Design a binder for this molecule. Structure first.
Ligand SMILES: [Zn+2]
Ligand SMILES: [Zn+2]
Lengths: 568, 397, 208
């Protein structure tokens, strides 16, 4: 509501009118790292401002506390703050303790104004009503979710704010209950921030092939978790692809020739940059379907490749070096027997960028490599600071990778993605054989204490990858109901478990009467309530509240409260 | 037919003259430079060729033996066009490849790989000596005296038996003078020790290289090779043919002081206790033995060898004697840090030379136990060190 | 016309192989062999050969395991015939393997254009000394310790040739693995001459 979709252009014009001055930079863009779509959105905004030639600054951030301290050091000269993928649900005014009177200037007259402007692009869903309504210094580029779902919430909020006694109770309790009901609901990203920014550019008419590519990448990254959102947005991106597509068709391939064409993007892993056999061997969906984690799954994989009539040796060959006959008839090969093995869902048409003779890349593979670069791009408080510094360095490395010129960095990211994926697969199979997953009847707890790959798992995204693979296998396992999934990873240097609360998910292909319903994630709220109740040291500072830290000894007591918690 | 060969040649010419990345005709420039240094040969990345057009790469893979010569001809034509002004000669250019794809273990190679461009690696065990290969021949007909010639390739011919303007069964003969030839080596490769299966002999295989690929490596050098699995009818089993490999390209697995080095050494000299630092640095695990460290430093440093005007020379190589494994570790460290060294505790195609000690020169020669060492008796060492010496030991260590 | 398995019992030929080489006889033998492969099962009733084919495709192995007793159990007539003339029925049974494998793994020829039948549990056994000219030209199960092994060198599985006189191309004759080809004649011009091998058309098999 605060800034609806229609008024994005107006907000942008206001930002210009305020911070546009070649004399100095008054625009600062706070960005929460560890989010592909956030990075894409930030890059798009950077390019836009570069066109507008408005000096500004980029501020990578990892934790809410980092954001707080960064705001503390802010200078009054800055009047525009862009928050990318963070702060939407929190009461930023409260969290940053912003006093309207401190910033109020030129209020007049039925008008208001302030010295600074906090623009929020954090499109999770459970928007902080105070930010939406209570605050004015807070600016939120809403996707219309408020005006389409929170109208009753708006009414209740404005009534409660209006209330300043049987009738008083008879109204206040209902409004409080309405607001609480809007609360106590798990977070679930609503839409691509990249999509919102692309829409804004369309409003400003800045749309170009590069911007569409960036939006595609952001949405594709979002896909894995919120596949429904990706499905909803896919037609729009295809429409834009057709809109910007050049007239020339089948133009002779030249180095300058660059195309972004839609064609079958088989739901595999690094197909173009890994042997077909490897791509299948590490495609989360593939392993979940065939349970490749068990050796019998590997046997079935060999059986499937034999059914394909593809020489296994060939299947392990480098994809770029496939024989032309197979490299082209793979379409028919997949058309046949994929249903026989139940892997028909793998077939997927998707965006695939390409340029000159250097080669081609699918948006999925590109975002995978971007995540790999983000993750492995390179006194306890100092150790955490250095780790987050490495994460920020990886953030900037990915930023550089976005440029086409730095194809070398993209290749490095591809290799890193391969290595991380294989390590994740090995760890997952070891876990499943170990049966570390414990059915607690409130969640399937799986705590990690083995040395190897533990160092890698200190990165929240690495843990998320492992948990995503585990969740894929579990959801495909019909025996397992959609229980909440808990992951923890002890850090020996800090002696803390990287607790992660991972929501369940219906089978990728699943799209029946159910699956339509979004299974919100209450992990964060449960963790926060337990932490407030208890005193076990933890770190909710991380923007992704579902991920938190805890002492090696504070874990099991915290886990005990967690299973004791009824919030989950 | 010849039209299709010309078409393939034209396609490769277009690839060379057009394949561009960013803003550089990498291959055009590379060819121009290689010509500029007279190195008439081009190296091509397979991935690049595929990117330009998969079809040419696939056709090459199908019939490498014939496709490759056409590609080399295209390279020659491009070189002439870019290096010599038209309407105003060069030799056939060697083509070098780099697939960088999945390898094939030496043992795994079999009939399946015949005539296929193979990509593998190993350690070169031995190197032959270069031989002549007739790229071009000058040919006289024995009776009618009809001149002619042949242009042969090192892939997949014999002197024609027919007169071509009875004259004879083979009236043609070679005129070595006008004919032209190239170099051709022969190398033997063994599978990687790791690649060797459990308790199995390491397999071995032989190759041939030519043109600029000649003399590019030496025995006992780990290397990765690209070539066509080839088979030749050795004069040395029914229907059994000897398998070899034609070396398309080589990559070295293992592959003077600048300003920085001399500056660092000068600063080291600036240090007053530099000598003490050294003594502290030799075999730190061997605590104590300070005099031993000092003597090690001295021996490593040698001495100012001088040759008098009368000719008699002043030796510069110092020789130190030591007296369990503590000394063994010391000598091991010495050889490790020694620029050149020979460590041996006394245990120690028609050509014979002197013993192991003879081969040692410069650097150092270490022996854990002379009291144990008696091979060739002491007198050999007596002479080799006192005198630094058909049977003369022209060594200095 | 094709013949019955009982009709096959009547060899009615100069030699066992002479009977086998009979066209209709070959058809009957192939049909019976395929019937055995698809039908013969363990006491469990599972097609042991069906599972063997499954694994063969899965492992991409080019050799199919076969148990002699199994055929002796059913279609033993073919067991005796093979014992008398192993080569011919080996070829026929290899084609039967072609057909049995492809139905379960269509287009497996890509993985292996051919397959090799591997008989097992051959009842009769002889030592090297036991061997006799009577044994020659027939299958034998023998044991020992390998004395010396040679490296696996390629051998020309199939061979075309080229008469030096005219010799554009000569038939892709199958090399026997024991002797040379020595066509000693040319079809293009009826005479002898240097028959240069046609490198264009030739199949190579690992030899040892
Ligand atoms: Zn003549
Ligand atoms: Zn003839």
């Amino acid at each position: 509501m605060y800034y609806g979709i229609s008024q994005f252009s107006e907000a942008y014009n206001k930002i210009l009118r305020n911070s546009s001055s070649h004399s100095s930079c008054q625009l600062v863009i706070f960005v929460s790292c560890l989010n592909i779509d956030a990075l894409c959105a930030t890059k798009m905004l950077s390019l836009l401002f570069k066109k507008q030639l408005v000096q500004s600054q980029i501020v990578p951030i990892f934790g809410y506390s980092e954001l707080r301290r960064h705001y503390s050091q802010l200078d009054d000269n800055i009047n525009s703050l862009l928050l990318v993928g963070f702060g939407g649900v929190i009461d930023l005014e409260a969290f940053l303790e912003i006093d309207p009177q401190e910033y109020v200037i030129d209020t007049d007259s039925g008008e208001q104004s302030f010295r600074r402007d906090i623009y929020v692009l954090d499109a999770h869903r459970p928007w902080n009503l105070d930010n939406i309504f209570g605050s004015q210094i807070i600016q939120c580029f809403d996707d219309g979710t408020v005006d389409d779902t929170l109208g009753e919430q708006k009414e209740a909020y404005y009534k409660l704010l209006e209330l300043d006694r049987k009738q008083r109770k008879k109204q206040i309790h209902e409004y409080e209950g309405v607001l609480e009901e809007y609360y106590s609901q798990g977070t679930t990203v609503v839409n691509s921030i990249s999509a919102q920014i692309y829409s804004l550019l369309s409003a400003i008419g800045e749309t170009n092939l590069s911007n569409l590519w960036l939006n595609i990448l952001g949405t594709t990254s979002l896909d894995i978790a919120y596949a429904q959102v990706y499905n909803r947005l896919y037609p729009l991106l295809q429409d834009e692809v057709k809109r910007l597509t050049p007239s020339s068709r089948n133009s002779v391939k030249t180095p300058d020739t660059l195309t972004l064409n839609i064609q079958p993007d088989y739901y595999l892993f690094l197909l173009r940059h890994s042997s077909l056999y490897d791509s299948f061997y590490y495609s989360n969906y593939v392993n979940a379907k065939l349970s490749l984690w068990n050796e019998n799954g590997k046997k079935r994989l060999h059986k499937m490749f034999a059914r394909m009539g593809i020489p296994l040796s060939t299947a392990q060959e480098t994809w770029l070096y496939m024989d032309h006959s197979i490299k082209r008839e793979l379409g028919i090969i997949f058309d046949k027997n994929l249903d026989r093995y139940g892997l028909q869902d793998i077939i997927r048409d998707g965006f695939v960028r390409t340029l000159g003779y250097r080669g081609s890349i699918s948006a999925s593979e590109f975002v995978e490599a971007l995540t790999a670069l983000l993750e492995v791009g390179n006194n306890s408080a100092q150790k955490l600071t250095n780790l987050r510094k490495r994460w920020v360095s990886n953030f900037w490395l990915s930023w550089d990778a976005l440029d086409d010129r730095k194809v070398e960095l993209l290749n490095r990211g591809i290799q890193l993605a391969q290595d991380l994926q294989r390590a994740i697969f090995n760890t997952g199979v070891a876990i499943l054989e170990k049966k570390l997953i414990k059915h607690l009847r409130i969640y399937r707890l799986c705590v990690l204490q083995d040395g190897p790959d533990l160092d890698l798992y200190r990165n929240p995204l690495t843990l998320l990858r492992l948990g995503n693979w585990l969740i894929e296998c579990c959801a495909e396992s019909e025996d397992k109901q959609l229980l909440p999934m808990v992951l923890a990873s002890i850090d020996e240097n800090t002696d803390t478990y990287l607790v992660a609360g991972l929501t369940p998910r219906y089978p990728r292909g699943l799209d029946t009467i159910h699956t339509k319903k979004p299974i919100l994630n209450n992990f964060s709220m449960a963790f926060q309530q337990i932490t407030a109740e208890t005193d076990a040291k933890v770190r909710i500072d991380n923007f992704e509240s579902s991920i938190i830290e805890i002492r090696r000894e504070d874990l099991s007591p915290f886990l005990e409260k967690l299973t004791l918690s009824g919030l989950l | 037919n010849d039209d299709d060969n010309t078409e393939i040649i034209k396609s490769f010419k277009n690839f060379i003259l057009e394949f561009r990345l960013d803003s550089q005709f990498i291959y055009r420039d590379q060819l121009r430079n290689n010509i500029l240094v007279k190195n008439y040969s081009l190296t091509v990345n397979m991935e690049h060729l595929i990117g330009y057009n998969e079809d040419i790469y696939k056709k090459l893979s199908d019939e490498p033996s014939d496709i490759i010569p056409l590609f080399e001809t295209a390279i020659t034509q491009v070189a002439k066009r870019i290096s010599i002004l038209s309407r105003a000669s060069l030799p056939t250019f060697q083509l070098i490849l780099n697939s960088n794809a999945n390898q094939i273990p030496l043992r795994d190679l079999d009939s399946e790989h015949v005539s296929k461009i193979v990509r593998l690696s190993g350690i070169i065990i031995s190197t032959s000596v270069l031989s002549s290969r007739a790229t071009y021949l000058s040919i006289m007909c024995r009776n009618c005296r009809h001149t002619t010639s042949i242009t042969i390739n090192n892939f997949n011919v014999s002197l024609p038996r027919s007169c071509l303007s009875n004259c004879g069964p083979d009236p043609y003969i070679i005129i070595h003078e006008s004919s032209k030839f190239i170099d051709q080596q022969f190398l033997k490769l063994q599978e990687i020790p790791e690649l060797v299966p459990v308790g199995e002999m390491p397999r071995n295989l032989t190759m041939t290289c030519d043109r600029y690929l000649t003399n590019k490596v030496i025995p006992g050098t780990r290397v990765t090779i690209v070539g066509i699995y080839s088979i030749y009818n050795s004069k040395n089993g029914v229907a059994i043919r000897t398998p070899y490999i034609k070396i398309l390209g080589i990559q070295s697995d293992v592959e003077m002081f600048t300003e920085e080095e001399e500056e660092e050494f000068l600063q080291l000299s600036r240090n007053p206790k530099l000598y003490e630092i050294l003594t502290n640095s030799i075999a730190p695990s061997i605590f104590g033995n300070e005099d031993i460290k000092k003597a090690i430093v001295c021996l490593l440093m040698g001495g100012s060898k001088k040759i008098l005007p009368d000719g008699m020379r002043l030796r510069g190589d110092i020789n130190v004697l030591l007296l369990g494994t503590a000394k063994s570790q010391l000598l091991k460290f010495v050889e490790k840090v020694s620029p050149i060294a020979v460590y041996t505790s006394g245990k120690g195609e028609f050509y014979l030379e002197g013993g192991a000690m003879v081969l040692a020169d410069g650097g150092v020669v270490c022996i854990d136990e002379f009291d144990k060492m008696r091979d060739e008796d002491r007198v050999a060492i007596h002479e080799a060190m006192e005198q630094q010496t058909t049977t003369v030991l022209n060594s200095r260590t | 016309e094709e013949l019955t398995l009982e009709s096959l019992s009547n060899v009615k030929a100069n030699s066992y192989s002479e009977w086998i080489t009979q066209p209709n006889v070959s058809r009957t033998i192939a049909r019976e062999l395929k019937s055995f492969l698809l039908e013969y099962t363990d006491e469990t009733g599972r097609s042991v050969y069906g599972a063997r084919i499954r694994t063969l495709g899965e492992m991409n192995s080019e050799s199919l395991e076969v148990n002699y007793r199994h055929l002796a159990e059913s279609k033993a007539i073919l067991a005796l015939f093979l014992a008398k003339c192993p080569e011919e029925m080996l070829k026929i049974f290899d084609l039967v393997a072609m057909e049995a494998t492809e139905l379960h793994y269509p287009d497996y020829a890509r993985i292996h254009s051919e397959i090799h039948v591997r008989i097992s549990d051959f009842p009769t056994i002889y030592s090297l000394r036991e061997l006799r000219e009577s044994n020659l030209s027939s299958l034998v199960r023998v044991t020992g310790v390998v004395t010396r092994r040679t490296g696996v060198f390629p051998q020309l599985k199939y061979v075309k040739f080229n008469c030096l006189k005219c010799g554009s191309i000569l038939g892709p004759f199958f090399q026997d693995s024991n002797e040379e080809i020595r066509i000693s004649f040319c079809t293009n011009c009826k005479s002898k001459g240097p028959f240069r091998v046609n490198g264009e058309k030739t199949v190579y098999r690992n030899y040892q």
